[PDB]
A paper describes a structure:
At these resolutions, water molecules, coordinated ions, defined backbone features, and holes in aromatic and proline residues can be clearly distinguished in the reconstructions. Our work demonstrates that a modern 200 kV counterpart to the Titan Krios (i.e. a constant-power two-condenser lens TEM with an autoloader) equipped with a DED can produce SPA cryo-EM reconstructions of ideal biological specimens to resolutions better than 2 Å.
To further complement our studies as well as those performed using 300 kV TEMs, we sought to investigate the resolution limits of our instrumentation using a more conformationally homogeneous and symmetric test specimen. We thereby selected mouse heavy-chain apoferritin, a ∼505 kDa complex with octahedral symmetry. Movies of vitrified apoferritin were collected at 73,000x magnification using a Talos Arctica TEM equipped with a K2 Summit DED. The majority of collected images contained a single layer of apoferritin particles in a pseudo-lattice arrangement, indicating the molecules were embedded in a thin layer of vitreous ice. Reference-free two-dimensional (2D) classification and iterative rounds of 3D refinement and CTF refinement (per-particle defocus, global astigmatism, beam tilt) with octahedral (O) symmetry applied yielded a ∼2.2 Å reconstruction, and Bayesian particle polishing improved the resolution to ∼2.0 Å. The anti-symmetrical aberration plot of the apoferritin data also revealed some beam tilt and axial coma, but again no significant trefoil astigmatism. However, the resulting aberration-corrected apoferritin reconstructions using Cs values refined from 2.70 mm or 2.80 mm were very similar both in terms of resolution (∼1.78 Å and ∼1.75 Å, respectively) and quality, suggesting that tetrafoil and errors in Cs may have been compensated for by other symmetrical (possibly even higher-order) aberrations. Inspection of the ∼1.75 Å reconstruction revealed defined backbone carbonyl groups, clear density for ordered water molecules and coordinated zinc atoms, as well as distinct side-chain structural details such as holes in aromatic rings and notably greater density associated with sulfur atoms, all of which attest to the quality of the map. Local resolution estimation of the reconstruction revealed a fairly uniform resolution distribution, with the core of the ferritin shell resolved to ∼1.6 Å.
Residue numbers in the entry:
A (entry chain R), D (entry chain J): 4 to 177
B (entry chain A), C (entry chain C), E (entry chain B), F (entry chain E): 4 to 176
The structure:
């Protein structure tokens, strides 16, 4: 029998929120893997490491916000395994930025499908939640990553040895 | 060929550190599940939720410290799936504290086996690392959880309705 | 049946901790006796009295830390009589410093045997506890006492009347 | 031959002061035992533990004040064994408060006999010392302990599980 | 006849501490040589010079800490000649970082042998001293040097003329 | 071929500066040995130890200033072994002060020969450098040491047991 607070919250939306929680946790774990990679002594880009660690924590925050939403609407959180990232070795700062861009666009696509579903179920609170706390942030993150990829490519990374070093210092070091 | 920094770091220790990283991440995810449970409208113990969320973040910090150790010694981090917790529904504040106590003692046991291995491989830096940043913290956490279980039991939880409410306010608030 | 928190804590270690608690309490009582002695009107060295009173309180703190350890690991504290010091009359500042040096080295030896036992039982938390909070402090205290004995002897104490007076003022004041 | 400072200080008073020093040390050790008991993981009342630890330190201070008195009057301190407390296991917060009340009243009785002796020996400095620094403090401590016993009993301790917990928080947690 | 403070301190440990003191002094002198090299007008990398001068002073501090340990345990310090570094001319910032990495790993190896010896002699105070003040610092220094070597190599040093200049400004400045 | 900055700097001056660098380093090591000696538990004069440790660091600073001069004038620093001090055991505070006085006067004599050489080679910058940063400091140090020797002797050291103790407290404290 439904939660005492549950109103206008379709079971399909509940399931899709649980899937999105898992995806945010997965993204957090991918960024954590990237951060570990740039901390290796044979890579040693401290500001790449800092950048992706920050991203990892932000993705965890996103997941926790979705869990709060789920309880607030009277849904029930069902956690699933967090799959390991597709790679141990991220090959270069440029490659990691490109993979992060791909990841962020996949997360964005999942959010857009979630918003489609909430619109189809006439759930304006959920639509507004997604728009307010997620869509704008994704567009910003995607644009940032695209900018970084563009600059790294123009500087000549990975092959120009100086490029990732100086990008680490100037763009990611403030 | 070995990392330029690698010295006196046995492949067995490297593997065991990777396993411990996974275990800390798993513990973080268990505590996150508990925290979500006490945020439910039909449970609604805000300070239980806060407590376990804090524990979740601390476990993530422990994992990140182990990853830093791994890179510092020239090992290579290999991540694995983080398995889902054994339960969605943690049944009561007392039950969650008991499960957390069990979890912390399993993590402690894994750390003790890691210290055994480092001692067997004559790796004093790793032994000292475990002693300094892990063993003492585990003993403290286990003692705290035991205390909470004891008080909850004596108050009459879960069946005495007032017990978890007042414990939430007094001890965890 | 064992405490809910007890893990990897051997009954022999528990017993040895209780013995060490008693020894620390005994040391506290010895230093208290010394302090009383230098407060006598026919001795009247106020800074010797202060020094040994400080040592007495520090030894009590050491005992209380061991009791906390015992409860933290799930052992049970069993107190015993605190025997009276071997002497009422400590004869001179030099003699008291020499007796304190002997006492501190006996306490150190007991701690070293405790660390041996913890190592034999593969109890790294207890080993680390002893190393961290006890061994270093003992080495420091022993060195300090040795220094004081050396200076007092060189100054000509007890027989040079000025020596303990000036040592009281300069070193201990 | 007597101390150069000794005046109007009877050997019987000196002996009785040494006995009182031992009793204060014993009381300190009893309270230390109680404090250890409430720190056990299967008891776990932190404010009971704090309370009795405070009492233990206060009893040690009382003993040290008596030792100072002894040297001030030119008596000589003779220490004796400090006997172990009668119990390892203090059974409950109520039981420990009751045992502490009994202990404090025994210490008070010893102080009253000491004051009787000082009065019989016409030693007004010692009488005043006892009155000023000891008797009033004992009456206060006894009244406090009686109050705590009364409240614990009325709350239903030990059998009402909530009683010692809430007393720990409200009365002893200030 | 032994020092009044000496307890549980084996003659082999005393000798090994004296050898380690000499090694730390030697390391200090090597880093001083490197620092002088980067101050040459035909090299002129001020932040390399600063970096290695800092390292030189830190190595001297390490030696002085070992001397304090030696006196604290009642051993006797016997100094030996400090041999001159193997090179006057360190060839480049990358080469100096590589030689420093090699040096730090040799010092680490000597510390590990010292810890082995202290463990074999059952000297927990000395083991803890080494772990606490030396091993962790060495692992950190080795990791740092490895990082610097990695970055310099990737930037194209020594042959890319800009590399050491910009590394001097960004990483070491 | 000469350094681009080298002007009016004779090869003999360069060699003599390298010798002086070695002598300053040697002096630093002698004072370090003295400092260690007064830290022994059977000597235990803390302010003698502090005093000579300060002197050791000052001598190292002198050496580093000479190395800077060498690079500034375009000479090349060639380091040599730093020989061990002539003694492990400095026997007493008075004896150590006397040996320090002898050492400082030998360093002064070497500086005077260096100034003679610079004057003979018509190198006014080097002459001024020696006068400004070295000669005056040496005269001051020699006078100070002479004062300390005089007072220690008059107090009756080493044989008057109180003398070095009180000198440690009053003059060096």
């Amino acid at each position: 029998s439904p939660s005492q607070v549950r109103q206008n919250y379709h079971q399909d939306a509940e399931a899709a929120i649980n899937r999105q929680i898992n995806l945010e946790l997965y993204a957090s774990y991918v960024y954590l893997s990237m951060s570990c990679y740039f901390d290796r002594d044979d890579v040693a880009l401290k500001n790449f490491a800092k950048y992706f660690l920050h991203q990892s924590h932000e993705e965890r925050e996103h997941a926790e916000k979705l869990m709060k939403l789920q309880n607030q609407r009277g849904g029930r959180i069902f956690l699933q395994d967090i799959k390991k990232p597709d790679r141990d070795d991220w090959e270069s700062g440029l490659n990691a930025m490109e993979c992060a861009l791909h990841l962020e666009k996949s997360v964005n696509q999942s959010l857009l499908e979630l918003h489609k579903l909430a619109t189809d179920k006439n759930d304006p609170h959920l639509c507004d939640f997604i728009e307010t706390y997620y869509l704008s942030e994704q567009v910003k993150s995607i644009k940032e990553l695209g900018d970084h990829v563009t600059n790294l490519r123009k500087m000549g990374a990975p092959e120009a040895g100086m490029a990732e070093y100086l990008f680490d210092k100037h763009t990611l070091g403030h």
